[PDB]
């Protein structure tokens, strides 16, 4: 049939079961020596009968399976919730850490389609980044999720750009500094500056120090809506612009253009797609998180020309690049003065 | 060293996990149903503009929702402007007999109730329902103070009530039965199937406020009101009337052990000599319970109400605790579902 296909697609059960299995460290406790439902219940601090009801469903959707009678063991797919796995999917689905917490915003998607405005504040009391400002808790969990891949996520985009005439790089909203770090060990003559918010700057400083790069890369606390701290031959916006509606994203773009030295470029590292090619799960899954968390968006190639020009810029070239960690393709846009 | 941009090793399993864990997808389906998007399409809306007008949404955000409905296979582009339901998307039409638009409608009782899954970890820690922490009252008190939710719950359950009770009504010989009491009997569909099968029998449906008016007008319209009364009450309290057969159709799964024993005792107290208590529900062997068609109802029951589906062995202990015994279970096999409904017949312990 395919009335079972519709029920599967509309199932709230399943993702909530995946996410509670992750929050409870379920797969980790089985691998650590929890053979029985009783031991698993002890380790997770759950009721044995209700845990068995959770594992019924974890078996049905393919994440656990019975080996011996009443003895449950992670499948290939279930093993991906192991906390030491490099894709960190367990963290990304933990209801205590920042991203899965924010997905609760989807419970009010109808509002966001009605208004075009984010849902997050109506649930948690503040807009997304102000919330993180007042919870060191989720500040740190968010930074660690997005930089879970730090050591390799930026190797490819840095390899695809020519750094020969670049003396200084500004990484605007550059996270824990990973993109600055990848450009640095790719191009030894280059120095860099990371601009980020409070919390994230201290964590960026310690990561850069621990890479051996504190002499080549500074971190500066600030606000990319105000003038940028320095001038630069290349300015990076990796996963920033999608957080903001058009007007805000043109303001950020415009501040970057003002900070560009003669001949420099701006590199945008997120995701886009030709309009006709945009009707896919990768583009939609991020575009809609951006709507509901932030009032942001992903933008098509065509829509990027419009934003570029509002900021006195042209889109010069676009490559697509694969993530080394997760099933997802990224885009690197290079923008020049018009 | 040179850079090589490999994809991750276990990338197929990774997209399987990421897909299964995604909340946006079931929410996109559910907002499509609530917006009645597919009925607006089938009723002549061809542009995003016209759909945005009928749904009362902002065109640009509606196109974004529509984007993901295409990727998942519920909508497609027939022509550059217009979007149209697939074979699968067609089931979100409101007059489809499987009723999935209504089951996924965030404005109606069950899908609204599903938000309770957002706190499933509490339910696994405590064994206790989540619905009250979200919506302020427990499940049936909420419906009681919310006439629209009361009616949408009743109308979802009574879906095929013209037909769905025909089998359970035939799973009992009504010869030595004068009166049947259906405890929590919905809009009176089970009482109706019994009544046109067994001309000699009278029945009373016991139900809550709201549901009773709806049961009354359905029974009136079947031409059966001279044969079937309806009585507003509480099955935790003494029952309106003694009876020869007392029905409990998809009630006990709503309740934890101790509440279902209280209900079963109330049924036993109202029972005439030689009469029987008939539970219409499921009776699945634990060995056949590791599938979505069991866990969906069972976990809804955990999180909405603190209830459970009860496997084969569990009923003997529930019955005994009410001073009853399971004489036998009659299966109700059917081609539409991989599992069996059952009719458990209960007598007094001695
Ligand atoms: C499942 C795919 C993905 O992981 C893709 C992307 O994450 C990518 C890029 C990360 N990065 C460099 C920022 C990192 O390399 C990660 C492993 O993959 C990404 C991603 O980039 C973000 C989010 C994702 O869920 C994901 C992931 C997703 O689409 O889940 C539905 C956010 O939720 C998010 C929330 C709030 C603000 C944000 O912007 C700063 C993001 C965000 O950038
Ligand atoms: C499509 C599958 C199903 O309909 C199965 C079941 O319905 C049963 C009993 C119906 N009935 C008598 C009302 C119907 O006649 C048929 C025998 O299937 C049922 C079902 O029985 C219930 C629910 C379902 O979704 C379903 C459906 C389902 O789980 O969808 C995946 C509830 O949501 C629900 C919510 C709150 C309280 C409830 O208890 C009274 C229920 C409930 O009983
Ligand atoms: N007004 C503001 N000023 C400076 N940074 C901001 C900001 N608003 C949000 N940000 C930052 O921009 C970042 C987006 S996410 C991290 C992106 C990082 N470049 C990466 O690709 O991994 C967040 O780290 C957040 O700290
Ligand atoms: N205290 C109470 N007294 C009478 N009915 C109650 C009740 N608590 C819950 N119920 C009812 O029990 C029903 C469970 S669901 C509907 C069951 C119906 N017999 C059927 O097979 O479709 C609900 O209709 C609800 O109204």
From Swiss-Prot, chain A:
Binding site for substrate: 149, 243, 289
Pathway: Antibiotic biosynthesis; daunorubicin biosynthesis; Antibiotic biosynthesis; carminomycin biosynthesis
EC top class named in words: transferase
InterPro entries tied to this protein: COMT-like, O_MeTrfase_dom, Plant_O-MeTrfase_dimerisation, SAM-dependent_MTases_sf, WH-like_DNA-bd_sf, WH_DNA-bd_sf
GO MF assignments: methyltransferase activity; O-methyltransferase activity; protein dimerization activity
Cross-referenced PROSITE patterns: SAM_OMT_II (PS51683)
Binding site for S-adenosyl-L-methionine: 139, 173, 196, 223-224, 238
Keywords, alphabetical: Antibiotic biosynthesis, Methyltransferase, S-adenosyl-L-methionine, Transferase
A Pfam short name: Dimerisation
One annotated GO biological process: daunorubicin biosynthetic process
Catalytic activity: carminomycin + S-adenosyl-L-methionine = daunorubicin + S-adenosyl-L-homocysteine + H(+)
The protein's Enzyme Commission number: 2.1.1.292
Domain of life: Bacteria
Stated role: Involved in the biosynthesis of the anthracyclines carminomycin and daunorubicin (daunomycin) which are aromatic polyketide antibiotics that exhibit high cytotoxicity and are widely applied in the chemotherapy of a variety of cancers. In vivo, catalyzes the transfer of a methyl group from S-adenosyl-L-methionine to the 4-O-position of carminomycin to form daunorubicin. In vitro, it also methylates the anthracyclines rhodomycin D (10-carbomethoxy-13-deoxycarminomycin) and 13-deoxy-carminomycin at the 4-hydroxyl position.
Family according to the record: Belongs to the class I-like SAM-binding methyltransferase superfamily. Cation-independent O-methyltransferase family.
Oligomer status and interactors: Homodimer and homotetramer in equilibrium.
PANTHER family: O-METHYLTRANSFERASE CICE, PUTATIVE (AFU_ORTHOLOGUE AFUA_4G14580)-RELATED
Protein name according to UniProt: Carminomycin 4-O-methyltransferase DnrK
Organism this protein belongs to: Streptomyces peucetius
From Swiss-Prot, chain B:
Highest taxon listed in the record's lineage: Bacteria
Disulfide bonds: none
Annotated metabolic or biological route of this protein: Antibiotic biosynthesis; daunorubicin biosynthesis; Antibiotic biosynthesis; carminomycin biosynthesis
Gene Ontology molecular function: methyltransferase activity; O-methyltransferase activity; protein dimerization activity
Residues given in the record as substrate binding sites: 160, 254, 300
Gene Ontology biological process terms in this record: daunorubicin biosynthetic process; methylation
InterPro entries from the UniProt entry: COMT-like, O_MeTrfase_dom, Plant_O-MeTrfase_dimerisation, SAM-dependent_MTases_sf, WH-like_DNA-bd_sf, WH_DNA-bd_sf
UniProt entry keywords in alphabetical sequence: Antibiotic biosynthesis, Methyltransferase, S-adenosyl-L-methionine, Transferase
PROSITE patterns xref list: SAM_OMT_II (PS51683)
Pfam families for this protein: Dimerisation (PF08100), Methyltransf_2 (PF00891)
Residues annotated as binding S-adenosyl-L-methionine: 150, 184, 207, 234-235, 249
Reaction equation(s) it catalyzes: carminomycin + S-adenosyl-L-methionine = daunorubicin + S-adenosyl-L-homocysteine + H(+)
Top-level enzyme category: transferase
Keyword hit for S-adenosyl-L-methionine: yes
EC number(s) recorded for this UniProt protein: 2.1.1.292
Function: Involved in the biosynthesis of the anthracyclines carminomycin and daunorubicin (daunomycin) which are aromatic polyketide antibiotics that exhibit high cytotoxicity and are widely applied in the chemotherapy of a variety of cancers. In vivo, catalyzes the transfer of a methyl group from S-adenosyl-L-methionine to the 4-O-position of carminomycin to form daunorubicin. In vitro, it also methylates the anthracyclines rhodomycin D (10-carbomethoxy-13-deoxycarminomycin) and 13-deoxy-carminomycin at the 4-hydroxyl position.
Entry similarity comment: Belongs to the class I-like SAM-binding methyltransferase superfamily. Cation-independent O-methyltransferase family.
Assembly and interaction partners: Homodimer and homotetramer in equilibrium.
Protein name, as recorded: Carminomycin 4-O-methyltransferase DnrK
Organism: Streptomyces peucetius
């Amino acid at each position: 049939d395919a009335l079972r296909t519709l029920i599967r697609l509309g199932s709230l059960h399943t993702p909530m079961v995946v996410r509670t299995a992750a929050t409870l460290r379920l797969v980790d406790h089985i691998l650590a020596g929890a053979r029985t439902v009783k031991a698993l219940a002890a380790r997770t601090d759950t009721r044995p009968e209700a845990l068995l009801r959770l594992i019924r469903h974890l078996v049905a959707i393919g994440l656990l399976e019975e080996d011996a009678p009443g003895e449950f063991v992670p499948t290939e797919v279930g093993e991906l919730l192991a906390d030491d796995h490099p894709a960190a999917q367990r963290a990304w689905h933990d209801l205590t850490q920042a991203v899965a917490r924010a997905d609760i915003s989807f419970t009010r998607l109808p509002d966001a389609i009605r208004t075009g405005r984010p849902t997050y504040e109506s649930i948690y009391g503040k807009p997304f980044y102000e919330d993180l400002a007042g919870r060191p808790d989720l500040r740190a969990s968010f930074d660690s999720l997005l930089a879970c891949d730090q050591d390799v996520a930026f190797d490819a985009p840095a390899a695809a750009y020519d750094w020969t005439n670049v003396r200084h790089v500004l990484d605007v909203g550059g996270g824990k500094g990973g993109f600055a770090a990848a450009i640095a060990r790719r191009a030894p003559h280059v120095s860099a500056t990371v601009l980020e918010m409070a919390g994230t700057v201290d964590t960026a400083r310690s990561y850069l120090k621990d890479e051996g790069l504190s002499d080549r890369v500074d971190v500066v606390e600030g606000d990319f809506f105000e003038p940028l701290p320095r001038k630069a031959d290349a300015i990076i916006l990796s996963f920033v612009l999608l957080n903001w509606p058009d007007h805000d994203a043109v303001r950020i773009l415009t501040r970057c253009a003002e900070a560009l030295e003669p001949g420099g470029r701006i590199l945008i590292h997120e995701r886009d797609d030709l309009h006709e090619n945009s009707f896919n799960e990768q583009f939609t899954e991020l575009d809609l998180r951006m709507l509901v968390f932030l009032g942001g968006a992903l933008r098509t190639r065509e829509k990027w020309d419009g934003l570029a020009a509002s900021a006195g810029l042209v889109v010069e070239e676009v490559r697509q690049l694969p993530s080394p960690t997760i099933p997802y393709d990224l885009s690197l846009l290079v923008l020049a003065p018009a």
